[model samples]
Structures are given as C-alpha cells and as structure tokens.
Target: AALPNPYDDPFYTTPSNIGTFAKGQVIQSRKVPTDIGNANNAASFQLQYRTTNTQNEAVADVATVWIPAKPASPPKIFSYQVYEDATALDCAPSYSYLTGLDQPNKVTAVLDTPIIIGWALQQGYYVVSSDHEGFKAAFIAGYEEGMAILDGIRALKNYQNLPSDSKVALEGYSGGAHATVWATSLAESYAPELNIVGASHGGTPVSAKDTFTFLNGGPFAGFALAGVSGLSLAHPDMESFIEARLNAKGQRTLKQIRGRGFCLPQVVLTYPFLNVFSLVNDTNLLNEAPIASILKQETVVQAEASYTVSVPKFPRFIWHAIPDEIVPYQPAATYVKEQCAKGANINFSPYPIAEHLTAEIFGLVPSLWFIKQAFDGTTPKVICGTPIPAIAGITTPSADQVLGSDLANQLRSLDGKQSAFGKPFGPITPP
Candidate 1:
C-alpha cells in the first residue's frame, strides 16, 4: 500500500562497481504507471542513470520519461526540472508522482504534474522529469541538479533510439526553475551534445547570496534553511562549516531536515516567518568566510580558478511574477539583464500579477510556446527586458482562471503566514 522511501529501497543505492559505467549510462530501467496524467495514452518509465556530483565524482540519479502514444514525426525531448525542493528521498518526482502523493500534506505540486508535463506529452513529445537533486535531495545544489537533468536526457536517448537530430527544450518554475536555469548555464560546457534548443524558466534564485538574504526571516524562511541543509549534502567541508556556526536550535532543525521526510510543505508549516540566521551564532554570518565562500562557489559556480564560468549558450526565455513574495522579482530580473548583457539570446517577461504559486500558471502557456518554437526550428528573437505597463487589471489573470477557483484560492492563500516584516533581515553588513 505504501512505497518504500529511497533510503530503504535497494534500487536507489549506488552500485559498488558504478565506476565501471560510463557517464549518462542507464544503470536500470523499469516501467511505471503515471496516475496523474492520461496514463493509458502514454507509457511512463523510471530509470536510474549515472551523473556527476559537484565534487566531480560519479553518482547515480533517477528520472521518469513519458512516451506519448501518438508521436511526432521527428521526435524530441522536453526536460521539465520539477522542483523537488525537499530533503526527503521519497519527495522526488518518480516516488512522489507514482505513490508518495498519498502521504499527508498534499503539496501544491500535485496539480503541477499534469499541467506542467501532461500537456507536453499530449503534443507527441517525449517528456523527461528527473529527480535532479539525485538521492541526497540536495535542494539548492545547482550543479548536480543540472548534471542530473542533462544526463537523464542522454540516458533516454541511449536507452531508446531517437532521431539523430532530435532537439530538447527545458522548462521549470520556482524551485524547479533553479535546476532548469542551472542546466541552461551549464548546457554549453557540460552536456553540449544534448542539442538543447531553449530554456524557459521563472522564479530562479540566480544569486544565492541575494536570495538567502531575501528569504532569511520570511514565510519562505524554511527554504533558506532548506538551502543550507541541501548545500551541505551536495558539497564537502561545507557541512562542518555550517554545523559549527549553528547553535542548538539550529542543530535540532538541521538534524530534523536531513535524513527525514522533510518535504516542501512540512518545511514551510514547521518553520515560518522566523529568522533562520538567528539560529546561527554569528550575526556576521552572510559576509563571513565559509558561508560567503561557499555561496559564491556553489551557486552558478562553474567558474575557473580565481574567476571563470559558462553563461547560457542556448535560446533562453526567462519569466517572473512581479508580486512574488517568496522570490523577489527585481534581483531575478537583474539576472536576466546580466545574461542578456553577456550576449546570450534571451527573452524576459514580467507578469503584472500573481505571487510565487500563481505565477507558475501565468507563465505556463508562454513557456510551452517557447518550447514549441524550439522544436519547430523557429528563429528566436531576443526581446529580453521589453517593458510592460503596470496598470491594474491589465495583467495576466490569477491561476484561478485556469486551475479553477477552489485550487487557485488555496494556492493564493498559501502565503498567508508571510511576514510583512521580512525586509528587516539583511545581507549582513560588514563590521
């Protein structure tokens, strides 16, 4: 009646001889039923593939691939980086979508699985949703998440023969967009052979330092705490650095986060509108040695010695909700501007209405259209930073328009616990 958590499942265990397998090789594949979508129309399969960690070591990660019953003539892959912003192994898409949704705390992602993915499958596109965080549930570990996403595409091609010129489009929103954008930034150097055509992402935490400060004591404070726990799991030495700074309360919170079923809603409900930094001993935490160093290194952290990194080389469409309380809008828009300044082909869209949850729906239709343009070989025009009027009622409708009143009302209400005083939290001024 219940699915085993990834820890208890032997399938998730890294094989001892894993070093023998090539990168992106599928270690195992199994047919799985997709209960959320039109399961009868398309076949869903779960596979374990080899991917690289931030430490440059090989590790096994999992992905779920959907093959549409009615197919496109020249097949393509749509990589959707579903945000498994979780510390629990079972919260991964394969586990959660397949069986874990029955668990308490019915997350907002349940509706997203269909709207975010099923529509693409209906278009006769093969869709890939990977557990981008790998087995560790490393929430903000962007590098591993990107590598896991790319490798899943490769494993799918390797597992089932596809057209030689098959193209790929990547999409995600909110936490999911973290992986999607990271994949965009890393696609050129890390997995260039994937023939990635477009990246459509929204609500990305482009600057880790900025977002850490943005979310520190807000309703989304749990995510900031989650980010620390995630980064510790992804990298080495970083764990001790974080642990040494955290006081007893922080220690208990961090301990509860790791190796437990600390999924998204649990984190949110358990810790809300509190300063995550208050748990740490140092008031000078953000600007301090290891925290600053790790945040700089780990985030968008593909740089060479001293300073170097890869920017997006593919056509990119970045979007955000102007009213997003969870992820501030301007910092993310500034990131878009930076990417455009770097000569990357990009388009930026700022929706006039909606918050963190509702913005996903507002951005959904446009994102899918961008993917269509990529698959059709449409020449993309860079309209990044094109300004729009801020007139009320002139903006995109709230998600309720599409997701229906009941569900959208529930989503919009999720931010009720958000603090009006989150702004007082700081980037931590130097003494």
Candidate 2:
C-alpha cells in the first residue's frame, strides 16, 4: 500500500469550526511526536497567514511549531529557519522533521536540521520552524518568506496559549539567513506587535544577482541554476521567459535538472561547470529584454530602496566569511555597513575562512554565543564607526573545536552553569 498523503488528510485540513479569522491566526492544531536524535515533546499546527505571490495576489500558507519540554522559564520561542534551497515540497524542514528522514547522501542537509533542533531543545526553548518558502516551495522569494516567518510566530503564540508579549529571537544561515534578513527587515512594519529581541545570521546572500554572477562558471554553478529554478517555480513569468529564450537542448537540460526533485548535492555534483548562458543561442542573454527585466525584478542587490527600508530596528548579529565560495563576501559586508550607517543596532563578525563549507562550521561557535547573550537579556553594545576585525587563518573545525571546553566556558560566563552535551534533562512530558 502507498503511504498516506499528509496534506490531503482531513486532520490536516483548515478547521472551519473557527470561522473567519485575521492573518496569523491558528486555524487548526495537533500534537506530534518528535525525535530530534531522541524523543521529545512537540506540537504541529497550520496557520492562517497572508502572503503575496509574484503577481501580488494575497495567499494563505502553513507553518509548523515544536515546543520543547521542561522550560527553565516560560520558554521563549526561538524561530529556527533551515537553509532549504530546493524547489520541492518534500524538501521543506517541516516535512522532513515530521518524517524523521533525510535525503540520502546529503550529510550537510541532515546535520543542519537535527543538530540545530537538538541544541535548541537542550537549552529548554520552544522552537517554531516555519516552511517559509510556502506550499509551492517558492525558494528565494524574499517578501513571502518574511511574511510567513512573522505570521508563523504569531500563530505559535496563540496555539500554545503563550502571552502576546512573549520574547522571541530569529536564527538562520545561508538560504535560511536570507529568510532571517527579510523577516527582520519586515518585522517593524509588517508585524509591529511581535517582540523580536534579536537575530543571529551568518553566510547570508545579500545580493542574489551577485551570487548568480559569482557562481555562473565556478565549481558551484549548480547552485546558480537552482536559484533560477526556484524563481521560475515562484514566478510563472520567469518560467515563460526561460522557455522562450533557451534552445531545445537547454530546455531539456533545465527540465531534467529542475523539473525532477533533486536535492543540493545531486544537482551540484551532476553539473559542476555547466555554463547556463551557453544553453541559449543569444550571445547577449543578460542584455536581452525578457531576461534583463526578470533578473532586475528577482535579484536582491545592495542599495535597492526596498533593502534600505527593510533594515531591522532591534539588535542584530551578522557574520560572513571573508572569501566565501558560494555567496560573495563584499556584498554582505557592504549591506551591513549601510545598515549600520542608518543607525541600526548591529554587531558584525567577519571570519577569515576561504570557503563556504568551512565558514558554516567555524561561525557556529560565535553564532550560538550571540544567541545565548540574546536569550540572557544581555544587549550587545553596537560598535558602529569602528572597523570590524577579522579572525586570522582559521582552518576546518574539529568536533572538539566546535564542542569543547571553550564552549562550556562561554555558556558558564552567561548562565552560571555547564551543560552535558547530547543529553536532555528528561523526556518533555506533553501537556
């Protein structure tokens, strides 16, 4: 027999009993079993939240929540955004978390999920991981991602009977960082009632167009193709634009790579140095009217008016590797500098790592420390006007390096105690 479809189930349907409601309202909720390396207390729900499509039509999307057991306090909600870079529903963190499965051979993707959730639960925090990409997995649509994140938080509070004034913090890296930046940017205007204390993000892609240019002919060309695939899935006009421009071989290549649901590793390894522009006969594809218009609309670059207005008002901890292989470092640095100039409270950290993968590992230590400070009610002193220092000659981190006495010392400095790694206090008794 085939497995049951979770989306089509009556239990998963939007509850009509609670007739019409406002945006961010909890339409329906149900308890769920969670085992992020071990069994724990959690809950899942569907939120009635409003977001817009590429055409600007209002649409409703769903978000999932997980409340950890045994709180040190009332348990502040930590909105953990996963770096989901695929254009398929099955790749959403919420779905993977529910199924307790990971895409085979993708160690990075699996580690990103359970590792983060396990750490957060051990700290006794309520975690809400939103499918910010929405139902169709509109991968990199910034505005939609922001709206879903803000509304997801609102829905979590209402469902769990938490106070409207509950404390919250946002965290993400890479594509997840994209969601974090956009959400922080939209918080003040879109959801003023939310008490977002701070946000910690690293390896953020500040400019989508710059990212495309950097990855076009590089070893990570598949990532650039994935971005285009995601945008096409989100915007039908983009799909039509590509179909109209590319030749038959190019169309087939796109269909085979994108139309099928391949994960990051599969896409990256399969097409190492694929020149996307070569697929089209047009020598000046970038200058072509159809291509240029869509690129301008979809690409999130520095100095854009929308970016200027989206700056976060609260304390923010931002970091980037000096020589990132995936997302360029200069654009991120430039964007943060601009925000700082605008009087935004920001603590910037620049790592000296030379590649994307190493940055993720090395940056985790500081990122977690920043989150700890935010949780402990310790405000980061903004050192604007001073040049940000870079860590020198950092290499690949070891398990000992990442989870060592240094980490314990940092935790003690903040919380006055040490935590045993890999062990929870006990099973979180469900309500």
Candidate 3:
C-alpha cells in the first residue's frame, strides 16, 4: 500500500533560502527507524544546511526547521537528496577517522553541489541520501540505507513544511552507488507513494558475492576481513557462526570494531592483511565441529542476497568499467541487463580507458545527461558503446577517442585481451 503524502501542514514552507546554506548551521542528527517488512533497523542521519564558502571551501551549515520544497498544483517534480561517501569509516564527514582521508570528502564535494546539487536544483528536484548502516554503528544498515533514502522522501511529504506532490530521484557513486541501487530495489515496498522518477548509480557494489571474491585475495584483503568481521557483528546469525571462528585476538578485534563509529579505516588498517581462510587458523576457529557446519552455511555469500531479485521502481542509469578491479563490473553489468529485461528503463555505460575510479569521469557526462532527459519527461536513449582494445606501446586514448573508437579496448592494460565489444558474459545477457 502506498503511504499518504505527509506534507499537509502550515509548517511546511518553501525553503526561501534555497542553496544558501553555509557552515556552522546547527543541524540535528536524528534516527529514522526502518522496517521494510522484515527486521527493524534504525537509520540515523544529520540534517543541516550544507553549503560552501566563496573560496568553495566545504563547511557545515547551521540547522533550521526543515523547510519543504514548493508544492506544484499538478505536483512539482522533485528529486530526493541523498549523500553517500565512497568508502568511509565514519559516515559523517565531521568524524575524526576521515579527517585526513580526502576520498570521502572529494566524493561529497563533487556530488553534493557540483554534480547532483546544481543539476537537481536546475531541474527542480528533491534529492535524498542514506549513510549506509555501518556508517553509524555498522549493522544491517544497507536495509536502513534503503529505507532512509525512500522515507526521507516520504518524510518530506509529511513535513507540513514541504510540498505534498514532490517526486524523488536518487544518485550516488561507489559505496554511495551501492546505497543507490539498494534504495531503488527497496523503494517499491517501503515508500511506494513517492514518485521515484529515476536514478543514476556509478560503480555500484551490487553483488557482495563477486565483491568478496575480488577483495578476499587482493591487496584489499584487510578490508575484506574487516568487512566480514563488521558485518558478522551486525547480523546475529553471522555473529554466531563467526564467534566459533574467533580466537582471543579475533574476539578482541571484533569487540573493538563494534559501535566504534567513524573509526573503521584506522582500526581496519591495523589488522594483518589476511584472507578469510587464513584469518581463522586455530582449531577452535577452524572448520572443526559446529564451526565446520556453520562455515558450510551460506551466510557470507548471502550478504547481498537482497539484490539478487530486486527490481527498481523507476528508470535507472548505471555506469562501470569492464576491467574494474575494485568492484567487479561484470556483476553490475549483468544486474543492469537483468533489470532492463524485467522492463526497467536502463542506460548502461562501460568505460574502456577507465578502471574503477577513472570510470566516474567517463560516466559523469552521460549520467547527468541521462538524468536530465528523464526529468524532461523524455525516455532516456540507451546508446550502446564499447571501449577500444588497448594496443601495446599505443598512447592512451583520449576521452573522445575512446568513446568513438570502433575497436574499443576491453582491459586497461598493456596487453588488453578482455572483450569490449559483443555480448556480456554469464547466464543473463544484455538486451
């Protein structure tokens, strides 16, 4: 059942101060409880006026009463605002762990105003974001992340301060991309009334299955181990199974990780870069009695199971690199094709010259264009393009050269062999 639009009160007023938010705004960070017909997970967030200085320095704005967007007679089109960090220990930028790390800040600055903020404001859309569950306390926040992204839109409807006929569109990159995809899949059941027009997710970690395989044995082995430890601690079922594998040191590590908000990167960086198979070496921590059967259980593989059959409530714009080493682009491509097959209006772009991080630049131009088209009441053009195969001793192709190249490179390496043209691999094929 679609929930009623909640913006029908006197307090709801158009934020006269649109895009004028600046630093030192006393914003309130609150929690919105989540229950997507499954378990109840509380989603927390800090709402404030976000803005920048004349020098474009990032700063937090003071918080005032949440002002709602202007209502349209036939209902004004608005995109829900959602801010996601690429990869962060603390969900909030103000947190200490991310003080020195500039990646999350770069993502926030680039997307918040430069990419999404200006784009949405120009098009007149309400935006929404979910600080993934772990950002707060590291539980099953992915579900809550979905709920928050959707409910934040619903909440606007109820905010006698905003418009009653607001429509929402979501956007994110990398980890933020994960939240974007999850939110779309869960929006159908959670906040059905909010007209979700469209979404663009860049470099999404759509499948934990493929992601785990990629990170487990790579340079990011510590990140993988930390991820399992943190997730296991959040989900009780995995906790029980993982407990049998924890030695005194593992137990101590898990204890330290629990509830330590924003301290993830530092804490996780300290652990030895060990694979899951090597982490638990002791007999008690190994596949012995109960541990053996528990290990045999499919919990780790099921971390991203919610996404296996998810269908978006609106058209989607997805981007990734074919040879992405960080998050396997194959799963993202496969998933987008599957969703497209299910009648989803999807635009998939695979950047040939780019890897994981570089793909963002390749995708940004088209992604924004796609979103603009969706907001303009026009069906997005799902143009198919392939990366040119990298030739040895050949100069790296410029953005224009790569996009227009006939023989696009598959892998971003000296001896590129991965196919950029033709059909995608796996059971599900691109439409």
Candidate 4:
C-alpha cells in the first residue's frame, strides 16, 4: 500500500513570498537521525531551500545532508544524485526515507542509499542527497535538476557552516547522471562560487528523442512514458499540448502514472512493451507542430551552442556502454568528443557491456576511483585522443592495476551478480 502523501502538508507548501529569499537560502531545517533505526554515527538533517523551477519561478525543495562522525579536516563534499525517476512525491528520497516504507519502489531508497551513502560515510565525506526534481517531482527536467543540485549544495554548506571554498564533486548514473551533467554544465555560470573539482557520470541520456525512440515498444518503454509525464510537469505548455492530442487510453494512462509515485521497476512490470503512440490519435506525434517544438527544446544534443560553453572547466570522467539499450552510447560519445574538442579535460571510458543495467554496475568502481583521484588532487591526464577498450577486455592496466588491488578484490567477490526489475540486491534496510 502507498504511504500517506507528505506533499499535502503545509511544510511543503510554497508561500507567496518564496522569491523574497535568495537562492540556496534555507527556509527551514530540522535534525534527524542518520539512519532509519538511529544506528549510524553520522548526523543528518532535512533542509528546505529556495530554488528556481524550469520556468525560472521561485520555488522551494528539500535536500538531506549527512555529516560523517569522523569527517576529514576541511571536509570535501560529495553531492550524490539519486536516480529518482518517478513523478510521485512518495518516491522522493526525503519522504521514502522518513516514512520507512516497505514497498517495491521504495527499495531504491532503502538499498541504494545505504550502499552509496554508507560507502561515502566510511570515507569521511559530507554527503548531500537533493530532491533534485523539485517539489513537483519534475522528473527529466534537466534545468530544474541542475538548479536544485546547486541550491542544495549551497543550503548544505550554509546549514553545516562549511567553508565557502570547500571542494565538491558530483556523481550519478542514468537519471542521476542527467542531473550531474546538467549541474556540471550550469555550474560555471549558475553557481560560479562553487569549487567543483570534478564530475563523474555514466550511461547518460544525451538526446531525449533518441532515448524515447529506442525505449518505445521495448522492455523499458515505461521509462520513456515516465520521461514524457515528468517533462509535462516541468513544462505546462508541453503538458497541455500532450493532453490535447492524447486519446482516451493515452489520457487515462498519463493520469494513472503522473504523480502516482510508481518507481521505474513498477512502471516496467506494469506496462512492458507499451505503445506510447497509441495514447495519441496520430502516431507521428513528433512531427506535429507544437509537439515538435517541445521535443526540440527538451532534447539534449552535441550540436547545441551551449553544449560547448556550458561545460565546467574541471576534470570530468564519463563512461558509456557501446550496446546500451536504454540510453544509447553513440550520442553520448559524440557529445564527449565535442566537449573534448572545446578544451574540456575529460576521461572517456567505453564499456563493451551488451546492455544498460550491467554497464551501471561495471562502471561503479571505476567512477568511484575517478572521483577519488580528483579528491586526492591528482592531475587528470586527458584521454580524449587515446582509444579506450572494454572494461572487461582491458589487459594493459589489468583489473588490479586499474581499480587497485583492494577494489579489484571487492569487484571479484561480487562478480556475476545480476540485477533485475523489482528485485532487491539484499535486504531492504530502513533508510
């Protein structure tokens, strides 16, 4: 059963004077236990901060900050983006972790949070997990996600009294990667004060239109629909256009999933092989007038003038699987190449994995290592002109050489583990 909706509470209600406060200003904050059972050594809190929506309107959102018990001197901050791909308020990490809900969708908060956050805690880094989709769960709105991430970091810094010059790193994959990329792109201009040393992301969706086309009529079709539903929330104009074109079934499906709080797994299981076009009277929705304009606006591509100008002038580590089924690799590779040509220092890792899910797991250790290097102040060697090989097939550095002996042993122990929809990797411990 669904948990009671928290968005109904007055605490989440945006006031008329929302824009009066400066961006990243914390409106309210409350201390909370580090873990669901209060078993962790870290101190945690929920912070409500002022930020802008896709329309540049004043809005407020929340971010959870975790300070390790044994934080490093002048602690480095890690802004880990959760892949909260749902358009439901309940699916937000702030609510799911607070409610301690035991549901399929909530497992992401339960399992992944601890794995990532616990690891970060052990490393003595302050972590900030932002509700980047905004109060409305804006889904795939990259602009909103970027603003939320930057503002969340500002709020965390203010609340924790961290130095204004503290170094920060961004990490995410897939949906989370979208947030990381957008934040990195917008960092130089939107939040130039932030000392972002590096950003690491993998399996990013560079082109929304390409992603939608590839996922349609496939196992991950529900995600494409979710993207549509999320973009609709962020852009009311797009929502109105979609509603006007949608058939009865399309309208009903849109209504059923929009703000319904279903996670990606639930969506995949409930609506596999769904023909999203069937929701509309015309199959060529992309070719239509207003819809075409909306698609162009939403899609992220290498050709955009901002693509080169927006990238942060810092070390960036990006990876993608050649045969990725969900977010195709070619577009991302092209984007990386373009950024490199524009003088961005980037390390591009290409995995030979056959699908999206496996690539995520395969890239985890390397991404962590990349960020670790950035944290250690190692000068990044630009690998743009060098040819990279599949992670599984690399022999020059050897597994131990690339990941270090300890991490190599860890990866070896977890080798052959498989990930599936609606399947938990282990027990879903309380957040």
Best by TM-score: 4
Sort all candidates by lDDT, best to worst.
4, 1, 2, 3
TM-score for candidate 4: 0.89
TM-score of each: 0.86, 0.81, 0.61, 0.89
| Clash count for each candidate, listed in order shown | 1, 0, 40, 1
- lDDT for model 3 comes to 0.44
Tens-place lDDT per residue, model 1, 146-171, is 88898898888887788645788999
Which candidate order results from sorting by TM-score in descending order? Answer: 4, 1, 2, 3
Scored by lDDT, the top model is: 4
Model 3, span 13-132: residue lDDT tens: 224453453222222343322121012121223343332321223323211111214322333333332333223333332221111333322224322223334344334343333233
lDDT for 218 in candidate 3 is 64
lDDT of each: 0.71, 0.64, 0.44, 0.74
lDDT of 1 at 149: 90
Better of 3 and 4 by TM-score: 4
**Tens digits of per-residue lDDT for model 4, 232-316:** 8898877888888888899789877764567666776767899798888878777876666666656556574333346566888
Clashing pairs in 4: 36-431
RMSD of 2: 7.6
